[PDB]
Amino acid sequence: MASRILLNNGAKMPILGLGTWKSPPGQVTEAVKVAIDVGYRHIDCAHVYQNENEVGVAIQEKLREQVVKREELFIVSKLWCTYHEKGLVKGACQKTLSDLKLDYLDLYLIHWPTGFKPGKEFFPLDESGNVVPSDTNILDTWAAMEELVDEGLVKAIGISNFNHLQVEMILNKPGLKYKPAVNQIECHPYLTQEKLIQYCQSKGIVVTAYSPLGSPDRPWAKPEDPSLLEDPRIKAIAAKHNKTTAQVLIRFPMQRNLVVIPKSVTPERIAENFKVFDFELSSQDMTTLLSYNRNWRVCALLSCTSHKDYPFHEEF
Numbered sequence: 378m379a380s381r382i383l384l385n386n387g388a389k390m391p392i393l394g395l396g397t398w399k400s401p402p403g404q405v406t407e408a409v410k411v412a413i414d415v416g417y418r419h420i421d422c423a424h425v426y427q428n429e430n431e432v433g434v435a436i437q438e439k440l441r442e443q444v445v446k447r448e449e450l451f452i453v454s455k456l457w458c459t460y461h462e463k464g465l466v467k468g469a470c471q472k473t474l475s476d477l478k479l480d481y482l483d484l485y486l487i488h489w490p491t492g493f494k495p496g497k498e499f500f501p502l503d504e505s506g507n508v509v510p511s512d513t514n515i516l517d518t519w520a521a522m523e524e525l526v527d528e529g530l531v532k533a534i535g536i537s538n539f540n541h542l543q544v545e546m547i548l549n550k551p552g553l554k555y556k557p558a559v560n561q562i563e564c565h566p567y568l569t570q571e572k573l574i575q576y577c578q579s580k581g582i583v584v585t586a587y588s589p590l591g592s593p594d595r596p597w598a599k600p601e602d603p604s605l606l607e608d609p610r611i612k613a614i615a616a617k618h619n620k621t622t623a624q625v626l627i628r629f630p631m632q633r634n635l636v637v638i639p640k641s642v643t644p645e646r647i648a649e650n651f652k653v654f655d656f657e658l659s660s661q662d663m664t665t666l667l668s669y670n671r672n673w674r675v676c677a678l679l680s681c682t683s684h685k686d687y688p689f690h691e692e693f
């Protein structure tokens with residue numbers, strides 16, 4: 378298991394990164410410092426997570442300490458839905474750069490394929506609770522992302538939560554200049570994504586798996602939801618390998634040629650989650666884990682389901 382995967386822009390991306398959604402601003406600086414100390418070289422960020430400044434403090438301190446060189450880090454962020462408008466994309470990227478204390482991003486993603494009305498509110502709603510769309514389309518937003526590459530603000534661009542028809546739309550964009558390097562999507566044994574993954578990989582697009590542990594700290598969790606970390610079938614595979622269930626859940630996408638970005642602010646877990654390069658799941662383990670698919674999503678917000686570009690109506 379090599380540590381980095383080659384992207385279609387010629388750069389190499391670490392297959393294990395640290396997630397930062399829900400990482401409290403008073404804890405995430407130390408979390409990222411610990412992560413870098415124990416070997417992480419890829420951090421997954423987003424403006425909408427409201428903690429980029431604090432993530433940036435950690436990155437900058439480790440650069441200043443000369444624990445790691447900037448060239449050895451792979452920092453990812455994402456353009457929020459309220460910034461899809463052409464004239465807002467660069468400023469959104471620059472705000473993220475300023476908060477992260479970087480002069481470039483390794484990868485910048487369209488966070489969701491849905492544009493929302495610009496403003497201070499991340500989820501602008503009408504009086505009945507429906508998200509208010511913007512009249513932007515994914516193709517023009519993509520052209521705006523391409524400009525960021527051409528101004529040196531980002532080394533690679535990509536997409537997130539795009540279904541295969543939406544990926545196809547970009548691949549078929551008139552005058553397409555840069556193909557997406559990555560599609561970052563939810564993926565775990567309850568949402569295995571065989572079709573979308575094969576499609577993306579067949580086009581040379583690297584897939585990143587988010588919520589690989591099933592996001593047990595998601596704020597909308599319900600008692601009746603399935604629970605990966607507590608699934609006796611997955612625990613059994615972990616026991617066989619003398620690893621934790623979380624370690625199995627992280628190793629699983631790695632063996633599908635995916636990048637994976639588990640989140641933690643707990644130092645012991647940050648370290649545990651990185652110790653996944655010293656064992657191998659069997660082909661049988663892999664197919665067995667795949668067999669647990671439920672088409673169950675952590676991320677699929679009801680208020681956005683009428684947006685014309687809502688991604689999860691399509692089969693894949």
Ligand SMILES: NC(=O)c1ccc[n+]([C@@H]2O[C@H](COP(=O)([O-])OP(=O)(O)OC[C@H]3O[C@@H](n4cnc5c(N)ncnc54)[C@H](OP(=O)(O)O)[C@@H]3O)[C@@H](O)[C@H]2O)c1
Pocket residue numbers: 395396397398399421422488537538561562586587588589590591592593594595606621623624638639640641642643646647649650675676
């Ligand atoms: N592109 C998108 O739309 C999108 C959507 C969702 C997520 N993401 C990215 O993917 C990252 C990961 O997904 P996620 O945050 O939803 O959830 P996740 O990584 O599946 O799970 C995080 C949860 O698992 C716990 N945890 C971590 N390591 C553990 C271990 N070894 N043993 C037991 N529990 C453990 C964490 O607790 P503690 O932190 O308390 O240790 C936290 O409650 C996000 O942080 C974000 O960077 C992107």
Ligand SMILES: O=C(O)COc1cc(F)ccc1C(=O)NCc1nc2ccccc2s1
Pocket residue numbers: 398423425426427489491676677678681682687688
């Ligand atoms: O979107 C993420 O990366 C993680 O989820 C969130 C993070 C935040 F900081 C704030 C909100 C969310 C959240 O509600 N995410 C669930 C979402 N589902 C859809 C569906 C269509 C369009 C946009 C969204 S956002």
